[PDB]
Design an enzyme around this catalytic site. Sequence first.
Site, short mmCIF file in Angstrom:
data_model
loop_
_atom_site.label_atom_id
_atom_site.label_comp_id
_atom_site.label_asym_id
_atom_site.label_seq_id
_atom_site.Cartn_x
_atom_site.Cartn_y
_atom_site.Cartn_z
N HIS A 1 0.86 -2.10 0.03
CA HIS A 1 -0.66 -0.30 -0.12
C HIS A 1 0.55 1.01 -0.17
O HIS A 1 0.50 2.33 -0.14
CB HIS A 1 -0.62 0.53 1.62
CG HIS A 1 -0.31 0.16 2.30
ND1 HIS A 1 -0.39 -0.83 3.32
CD2 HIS A 1 0.20 1.46 2.93
CE1 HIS A 1 0.29 -0.33 5.08
NE2 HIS A 1 0.10 1.45 4.21
N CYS B 1 4.31 1.71 9.28
CA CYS B 1 3.83 0.42 8.34
C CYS B 1 5.64 0.13 7.60
O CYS B 1 6.47 0.98 7.49
CB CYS B 1 3.35 1.14 7.53
SG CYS B 1 1.31 0.57 7.66
N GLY C 1 2.65 6.32 9.14
CA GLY C 1 3.82 6.14 8.50
C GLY C 1 4.93 4.58 9.90
O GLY C 1 5.86 5.14 9.32
#
Lengths: 304, 304
Positions: free
Chosen positions: B41, B145, B143
């Site tokens: 993503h 991930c 932020g």
Amino acid sequence: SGFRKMAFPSGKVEGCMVQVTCGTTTLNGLWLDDVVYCPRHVICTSEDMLNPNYEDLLIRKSNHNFLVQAGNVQLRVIGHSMQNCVLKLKVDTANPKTPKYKFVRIQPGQTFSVLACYNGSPSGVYQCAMRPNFTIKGSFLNGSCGSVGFNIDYDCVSFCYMHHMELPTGVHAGTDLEGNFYGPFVDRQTAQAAGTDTTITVNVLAWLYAAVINGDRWFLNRFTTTLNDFNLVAMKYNYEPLTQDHVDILGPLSAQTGIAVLDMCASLKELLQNGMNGRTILGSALLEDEFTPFDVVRQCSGVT
Amino acid sequence: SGFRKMAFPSGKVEGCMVQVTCGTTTLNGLWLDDVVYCPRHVICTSEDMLNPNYEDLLIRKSNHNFLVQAGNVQLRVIGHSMQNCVLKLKVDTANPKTPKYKFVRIQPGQTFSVLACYNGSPSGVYQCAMRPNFTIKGSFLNGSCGSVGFNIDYDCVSFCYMHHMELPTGVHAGTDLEGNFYGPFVDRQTAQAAGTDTTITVNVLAWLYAAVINGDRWFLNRFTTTLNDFNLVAMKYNYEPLTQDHVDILGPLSAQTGIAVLDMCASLKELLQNGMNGRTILGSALLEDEFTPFDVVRQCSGVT
Ligand SMILES: *[C@H](O)[C@H](C[C@@H]1CCNC1=O)NC(=O)[C@H](CC(C)C)NC(=O)OCc1ccccc1
Ligand SMILES: *[C@H](O)[C@H](C[C@@H]1CCNC1=O)NC(=O)[C@H](CC(C)C)NC(=O)OCc1ccccc1
Ligand SMILES: [Cl-]
Ligand SMILES: [Cl-]
Ligand SMILES: [Cl-]
Ligand SMILES: [K+]
Ligand SMILES: [K+]
Ligand code: NA
Ligand code: NA
């Protein structure tokens, strides 16, 4: 979201751990520039530890009686001296992994990360608070002495603790990196008291604000109070007194939540008087006091 | 003595974290040999995340649309491919700090250390269990991930988790390093259920043995039970069923304490039925289930 007890990344400190052996006693040392720092009871036999005369014990030791091992390699010890309860061994090689660092003496209620080590090798990392009675609730076995506590700011490691001993209550005691104990303790294997352990009130309030930030709000009541009235409550429960300095430190969390500090105090008072009725706050059934306001802010803002 | 939730030293993993930016979206990547691994993503805009067609989104991206930054330096992306929910970016430079490593898919109930990162930089480390419903109770902000979970054995890092998302309950979900989610989750910003979270019975028993090893013994009662009778109790409280495999795993702690596993089960049953009456076990007022038998043994034996 979510809120967890979290330690600093340990990589900068791992590069500084060595093994120090004197006779049969082995422990950990901290290698920065050309000095290795370690607890002075590395020179004791088991018998010595009962009542050591450190000056007389050290006088029987020469540079070559200290074996200092960094991984596979021996460091050559070219001098030695005792500073308070720490021994400083000068070596012929500066640690090439020395990070930017300083030595700090930390205040009761402040937190730090412990890198627990055995035989010069890191075993794990956890967060501790210096309690108001100058003990910490750690996890330490034989051979863990010389493990250090530290904080990171940007790229500077601030070393604040070196581990020396366990008290009869199971809590832990140690020095700053100048070898001065936190608290009234001495490095002798004799029974020693730390006295009443009081709760870090400003930290509990920071943790309640952390709970609200992360959606936990059932304990917010309709009352407020005053500082003097709250401190009459606080001292009945062995909580530390709250000051305007603490109110101001909590200012930013108060602003984030819209909850006045004295409103949160009244919410804490009812928790103290009534308990939690089997509910939980941030997955705990006790009031947590080992998170500072800075710990809460840094966790809830993503500081790196 | 003492018993603490402790993470592995993080130094080997710090050396593998990078920043990955695609358009406006920035997150963390894991740099091992000449491949950077990150959540797919990173290619989504905010709108895309509501209902992404990842194949169609990725087809609009070329190697030069991925900015990969290791500290100050740009890595040159020379190829890319999507494996399940992870993106693999081939780079022209092998990470010189690549540790010995492998990728493992961990079992529910097992624990691991999370190195929480933002913008490619480590922020802190904490321990998590993979719950039986394949979520974790972490601490993650926007932020985070691409932050990873790992275990260390000697000098081999076993990567087992990469962070992708937060569920409406506030728990966290992610993949193994082959990009396959733990649990029934998909990487789309839509409401998703993890289902009933059951308690890791073997871990609670390991933690009770840890309590006894460290001097906490008030909860030991005079009863024993059977496996079938205990599991009738267990399932009423959403505890996982106990098996002879678990009994054997607890064998060494049973031996250390002299407390038969089925005796400890009867002690747990009364805690479940009667509560803790305001007492604490290892400083907790809840039964803790995020310590494995191996976690207890390694902490109580000083493994490095
Ligand atoms: C240094 O490794 C060691 C750490 C003790 C290990 C037991 N748990 C600890 O934190 N320090 C000592 O053994 C210390 C040495 C004196 C010269 C200060 N003595 C000590 O802590 O006595 C208490 C004790 C409790 C339980 C087992 C052994 C000793
Ligand atoms: C990756 O950094 C991020 C982690 C979220 C940050 C909020 N807390 C987290 O753990 N993942 C997402 O934002 C994820 C992206 C989808 C394409 C899977 N969406 C998400 O987690 O939605 C839940 C959410 C909760 C609270 C704030 C923002 C998003
Ligand atoms: Cl002194
Ligand atoms: Cl914890
Ligand atoms: Cl998929
Ligand atoms: K209130
Ligand atoms: K029993
Ligand atoms: Na000092
Ligand atoms: Na897999």
